[PDB]
C-alpha cells in the first residue's frame, strides 16, 4: 500500500523518499537519474523505488 520504511535486503531507510522521487519524475527525469540524485547506490535499494505500486490512493476513494 505505502512505501516500506526500509529496503528489504540491506535495511536502508527509504520511507521518506517517495514524494521526492515523484517530484523528480514530474520534472522530466529518467528513473535512473531520479534515483542517482536521491542517493541510492545499491541496486537492491533502487529496485524498491522502481517497482513500488502505490495502492493507498485507490484505497482512499473506495470505502
Amino acid at each position: 500500500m505505502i512505501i516500506p520504511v526500509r529496503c528489504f535486503t540491506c535495511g536502508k531507510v527509504i520511507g521518506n523518499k517517495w514524494d521526492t522521487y515523484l517530484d523528480l519524475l514530474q520534472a522530466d527525469y529518467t528513473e535512473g537519474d531520479a534515483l542517482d540524485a536521491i542517493g541510492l547506490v545499491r541496486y537492491c535499494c533502487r529496485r524498491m523505488l522502481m517497482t513500488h505500486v502505490d495502492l493507498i490512493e485507490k484505497l482512499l476513494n473506495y470505502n
Partner: peptide, 8 residues
C-alpha cells in the same frame, strides 16, 4: 501481500 511490487 503487505507491499505488492511490479516487475523490473
Amino acid at each position: 501481500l503487505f507491499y505488492p511490487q511490479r516487475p523490473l
